[PDB]
Design a protein around this ligand. Sequence first.
Ligand SMILES: *[C@@H]1O[C@H](CO)[C@@H](O[C@@H]2O[C@H](CO)[C@@H](O)[C@H](O)[C@H]2NC(C)=O)[C@H](O)[C@H]1NC(C)=O
Ligand SMILES: *[C@@H]1O[C@H](CO)[C@@H](O[C@@H]2O[C@H](CO)[C@@H](O)[C@H](O)[C@H]2NC(C)=O)[C@H](O)[C@H]1NC(C)=O
Ligand SMILES: *[C@@H]1O[C@H](CO)[C@@H](O[C@@H]2O[C@H](CO)[C@@H](O)[C@H](O)[C@H]2NC(C)=O)[C@H](O)[C@H]1NC(C)=O
Ligand SMILES: *[C@@H]1O[C@H](CO)[C@@H](O[C@@H]2O[C@H](CO)[C@@H](O)[C@H](O)[C@H]2NC(C)=O)[C@H](O)[C@H]1NC(C)=O
Ligand SMILES: *[C@@H]1O[C@H](CO)[C@@H](O[C@@H]2O[C@H](CO)[C@@H](O)[C@H](O)[C@H]2NC(C)=O)[C@H](O)[C@H]1NC(C)=O
Ligand SMILES: *[C@@H]1O[C@H](CO)[C@@H](O[C@@H]2O[C@H](CO)[C@@H](O)[C@H](O)[C@H]2NC(C)=O)[C@H](O)[C@H]1NC(C)=O
Ligand SMILES: *[C@@H]1O[C@H](CO)[C@@H](O[C@@H]2O[C@H](CO)[C@@H](O)[C@H](O)[C@H]2NC(C)=O)[C@H](O)[C@H]1NC(C)=O
Ligand SMILES: *[C@@H]1O[C@H](CO)[C@@H](O[C@@H]2O[C@H](CO)[C@@H](O)[C@H](O)[C@H]2NC(C)=O)[C@H](O)[C@H]1NC(C)=O
Ligand SMILES: *[C@@H]1O[C@H](CO)[C@@H](O[C@@H]2O[C@H](CO)[C@@H](O)[C@H](O)[C@H]2NC(C)=O)[C@H](O)[C@H]1NC(C)=O
Ligand code: NAG
Ligand code: NAG
Lengths: 220, 85, 149, 198, 50
Amino acid sequence: YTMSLGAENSVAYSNNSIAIPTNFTISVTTEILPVSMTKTSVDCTMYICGDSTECSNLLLQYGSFCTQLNRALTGIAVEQDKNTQEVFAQVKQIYKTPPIKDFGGFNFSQILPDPSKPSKRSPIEDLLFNKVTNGLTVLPPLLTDEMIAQYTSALLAGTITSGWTFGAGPALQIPFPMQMAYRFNGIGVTQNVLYENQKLIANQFNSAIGKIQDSLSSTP
Amino acid sequence: TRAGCLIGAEHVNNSYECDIPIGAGICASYQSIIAYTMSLGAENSVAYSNNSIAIPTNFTISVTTEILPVSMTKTSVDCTMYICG
Amino acid sequence: QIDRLITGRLQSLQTYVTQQLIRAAEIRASANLAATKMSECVLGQSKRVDFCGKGYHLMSFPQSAPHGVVFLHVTYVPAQEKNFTTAPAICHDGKAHFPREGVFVSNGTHWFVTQRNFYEPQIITTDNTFVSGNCDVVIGIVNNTVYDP
Amino acid sequence: SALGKLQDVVNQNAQALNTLVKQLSSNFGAISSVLNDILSRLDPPEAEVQIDRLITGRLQSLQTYVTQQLIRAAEIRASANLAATKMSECVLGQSKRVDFCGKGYHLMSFPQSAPHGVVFLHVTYVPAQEKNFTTAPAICHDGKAHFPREGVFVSNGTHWFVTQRNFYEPQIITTDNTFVSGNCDVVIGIVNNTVYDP
Amino acid sequence: LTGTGVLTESNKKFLPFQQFGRDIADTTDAVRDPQTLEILDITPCSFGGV
Ligand SMILES: *[C@@H]1O[C@H](CO)[C@@H](O[C@@H]2O[C@H](CO)[C@@H](O)[C@H](O)[C@H]2NC(C)=O)[C@H](O)[C@H]1NC(C)=O
Ligand SMILES: *[C@@H]1O[C@H](CO)[C@@H](O[C@@H]2O[C@H](CO)[C@@H](O)[C@H](O)[C@H]2NC(C)=O)[C@H](O)[C@H]1NC(C)=O
Ligand SMILES: *[C@@H]1O[C@H](CO)[C@@H](O[C@@H]2O[C@H](CO)[C@@H](O)[C@H](O)[C@H]2NC(C)=O)[C@H](O)[C@H]1NC(C)=O
Ligand SMILES: *[C@@H]1O[C@H](CO)[C@@H](O[C@@H]2O[C@H](CO)[C@@H](O)[C@H](O)[C@H]2NC(C)=O)[C@H](O)[C@H]1NC(C)=O
Ligand SMILES: *[C@@H]1O[C@H](CO)[C@@H](O[C@@H]2O[C@H](CO)[C@@H](O)[C@H](O)[C@H]2NC(C)=O)[C@H](O)[C@H]1NC(C)=O
Ligand SMILES: *[C@@H]1O[C@H](CO)[C@@H](O[C@@H]2O[C@H](CO)[C@@H](O)[C@H](O)[C@H]2NC(C)=O)[C@H](O)[C@H]1NC(C)=O
Ligand SMILES: *[C@@H]1O[C@H](CO)[C@@H](O[C@@H]2O[C@H](CO)[C@@H](O)[C@H](O)[C@H]2NC(C)=O)[C@H](O)[C@H]1NC(C)=O
Ligand SMILES: *[C@@H]1O[C@H](CO)[C@@H](O[C@@H]2O[C@H](CO)[C@@H](O)[C@H](O)[C@H]2NC(C)=O)[C@H](O)[C@H]1NC(C)=O
Ligand SMILES: *[C@@H]1O[C@H](CO)[C@@H](O[C@@H]2O[C@H](CO)[C@@H](O)[C@H](O)[C@H]2NC(C)=O)[C@H](O)[C@H]1NC(C)=O
Ligand SMILES: *[C@@H]1O[C@H](CO)[C@@H](O)[C@H](O)[C@H]1NC(C)=O
Ligand SMILES: *[C@@H]1O[C@H](CO)[C@@H](O)[C@H](O)[C@H]1NC(C)=O
């Protein structure tokens, strides 16, 4: 068939009519971004020739090709570690959440680390790790998965307990229903709207986080 | 180590910042050469409660440097002269 | 014969290293984008449209993934919109009144001022409006009273 | 090691040129790496074969060098596009983007020329000397809920004030700096305090 | 079939007509000794980067 771009929506434009929202939806969406690759190193002499000395003697006629290949692969390998360092190591303080998870009705259990798991990962992070499955060597990454999880845990604790203050300086504590009100003022909605409807917004946020986990678990 | 066998470095139980990267969380430094599991950061616990806020009473004007490359050396190679002279 | 094998294997290795370099450039671009999203969506609230999710961005949460990062973007989506009759200004006492922060709306008989992103009608007073000029210049100005506290 | 990013580019370009020059010393299976020696030693039927071996080796080396030069050119172009974005958004304006123009709340930026590069001096505002206060979402007065217009309610232990969020400047809670929305029965955590009327 | 490797005992049960063993990447990782019908794993020698 000929494809259809979208459903037609004739907006009811006139010179004296406006549409004002009377309600809101707290929507959580996923964005997946690759950060690093597998760090591969190739022994050029062993790949071309193995253990044959005559082959290596003939390979010496071609010069420093092997050195260039090894150096390019080494540059890629250090670039992967630099990429992980730039993405995850954006804080030099390891923040922790308080033992009491009283955030004014907001639930972060699906994104905070699970103490029951030995890997110290969140349920969402655990699901993400479960859903991803001759001279050649594979170098291990400089940051292990536990330390990357620790960095994400520190970022989550900072953004939950301190707002955006930890990204611009010292972590200044603020209650989470006040942080949310500040964010509401950032998008041009008054604080009263957040405070009056705090239970509904917390319920919507928890439902959206649960839908995110269900959608990741249910989509191949 | 998970990266491989390291000979000539004394493994210590202390955690420091990464000076020379070894891999799999192992880093090396000179102080003799020691090998250790690198620390991610100093540990800070934010004093969160449901009715307390922290307000700054002062400020620091901080100037930081950011170095960005813009161009390279413009190199031209005569292909005929390079291959054949 | 060994020379033929050497040149073939060397060409294969050069091809592999070249495509690895191209993929490394692509992954570096993606990682730079991920670091930008980490700085601007997680460590702050971004006014950039569609950079940190669909809708008005509230906050974001990072999650580690194998060779990657997953951002949970928490955004505000307006819903249950309602029609209202609107005007650019209110004419009162020969003066034009404009909303300080909101917008003038009418449900059919009465005029109110509300914030733009949520319906919260309030009485048009001098505290939430400002005066600029007379009523003869603004096209579409309507007549309504302006309360004085 | 402050200027390592520019020196890395200079070293990579110089090393690529040095490798390309060094590749002329390799014979690639021919009798000699010098063309004049082959042309002075052999008849054209076999000198053609030796020159052909040298040509294919040198051509492969030159193609390899051009390939990494194009990849590095793409990387430098991306870095230059980023530098142009920083010049437009940090120097020619004030950026609200977090960590794009330095660590902290960005105030302004200064460009400085560098060999094959640019150095941005980012002048930023860092909060310091923070102090604890007891806070509330709203103030209950006369059966009405009061919310700050631009600041935040703080308490030093006995008295309630309103201050701007990024600097401690306590002011008396009045009607000029608060707005009224609803009664006190809905907001969770509302506290009782007087609201002064000018 | 020649090569260099460490020949260890194998738990792979060959069918009686099969002599060599290959992995996904078409490299010989299992073999049968012709004198005594036993299965041997061929682990590559421990090459590494110094
Ligand atoms: C605002 O009013 C307009 C016009 O009265 C509504 O637009 C109509 O919507 C119905 C149902 O979708 C359509 O059958 C008509 O064709 C539309 N008219 C025009 C001119 O487009 C609009 O739905 C109203 N807005 C809301 C939120 O109810
Ligand atoms: C705004 O929307 C929310 C849901 O998005 C509404 O909450 C629902 O209200 C109905 C009827 O009161 C209940 O049956 C549902 O259980 C509620 N859902 C949730 C998640 O709480 C809310 O009523 C709407 N408010 C207005 C003024 O329209
Ligand atoms: C926060 O969310 C978690 C999970 O969404 C809640 O844990 C659930 O609690 C109910 C009742 O105790 C159980 O039936 C579920 O099996 C639990 N789910 C999981 C995944 O453990 C938790 O109760 C919520 N509230 C708090 C305060 O943590
Ligand atoms: C705000 O108050 C809290 C608790 O009253 C302070 O947190 C304590 O700080 C001391 C000094 O570093 C630590 O030894 C304690 O372990 C902290 N306790 C908790 C529960 O975190 C906090 O330092 C105060 N903030 C300021 C700016 O003084
Ligand atoms: C805010 O911080 C500045 C410096 O960061 C303080 O200025 C210092 O004050 C002390 C004592 O008055 C002097 O000895 C220093 O020489 C000052 N330094 C500078 C650079 O001027 C200032 O006093 C602080 N203000 C408050 C209210 O804490
Ligand atoms: C527009 O809104 C106003 C205020 O919300 C409505 O005025 C009130 O209407 C109710 C119901 O008839 C009366 O009991 C009140 O006394 C009215 N208040 C005032 C101050 O007059 C008005 O009816 C609405 N108009 C429409 C068409 O819905
Ligand atoms: C809004 O009010 C103004 C002034 O009260 C109206 O202007 C008057 O219009 C009548 C008839 O149209 C004239 O006789 C008067 O001389 C006008 N007065 C002035 C000061 O201009 C205007 O018509 C009103 N607009 C609407 C839509 O009712
Ligand atoms: C909180 O701040 C207020 C205002 O700065 C303080 O009230 C003043 O305290 C001083 C010293 O005790 C008195 O001389 C003034 O007369 C007070 N002013 C008023 C209007 O009462 C208050 O003491 C502070 N509380 C704490 C615990 O620091
Ligand atoms: C804040 O003030 C309100 C009203 O001044 C208090 O509410 C009263 O509480 C008493 C005893 O609990 C009741 O007998 C009254 O009927 C209430 N009046 C109203 C209008 O609700 C409230 O208790 C005060 N809160 C605090 C913490 O002091
Ligand atoms: C709006 O359009 C109507 C016709 O539908 C017209 O009568 C009226 O004058 C217009 N008002 C303005 C302010 O353009
Ligand atoms: C804060 O928590 C305490 C108990 O820990 C409770 O008494 C108080 O009502 C809570 N306040 C808010 C605003 O949730």
